[PDB]
Every structure is written in C-alpha cells, then in structure tokens.
Write a structure and sequence with these properties.
DIS3-like exonuclease 1; mainly alpha; RNA-binding; 1 chains
Amino acid sequence: GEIATILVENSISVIPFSEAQMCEMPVNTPESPWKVSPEEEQKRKDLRKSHLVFSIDPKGCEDVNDTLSV
RNA sequence: UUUUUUUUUUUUUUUUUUUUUUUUUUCUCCUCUUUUUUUUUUUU
C-alpha cells in the first residue's frame, strides 16, 4: 500500500502495455531469433575480431549501457 | 291358499384487446511547530 501510494502520488505509471503497443516487437523467438541481415553488415563496420570490448558493471546490472576500448 | 302398479344421470359454445429499466430528501464541519524549499556530479 505504501509503495502504491508513492507511485500514484509522484505521477508514475504501473500499467503494462496493450496488444498493438506490444505486438510491434522484435521477434526473439527460439525457432527464429535475431541475427543481422548481411546488407547491414556491409553498411556498418564490424569490430568483433580485431578489438577487445568488455565492461565493469554494478551488481545486478541486467542491462548494460557503458562500454569502452583502448 | 298372499295378486296389480309406482319414467330418469343440466341444455349451450365457432370470444376482441394497439406496452417497456427506474420511481421520492437529511445541515454547517480548527489537518499542531528546524526551515528557506534541496537540486551539479558518476556508476542502473
């Protein structure tokens, strides 16, 4: 009840989305997961082999932003 | 040696109809005390 009060009062929504607002989703299905269409591999410039990328990240970091490489 | 007569289960069937959830009261009302209100910054 207290958490709910803090939400309602401070103007924050707790409603999951609707069908048409969900459905426009990237299909990360097991029968066909995501993988890059090769024309975009052309158009971009890969570095997954010739350079090292890693990250330190806070405990519990289910979603990383920060990365660097020198 | 004991004849003859004294009716019985109401008659009738071939009549029209154009609405509609509910329904009807109760008054004015003293919110107590460190504050201006804090604020960049970075790791989600």
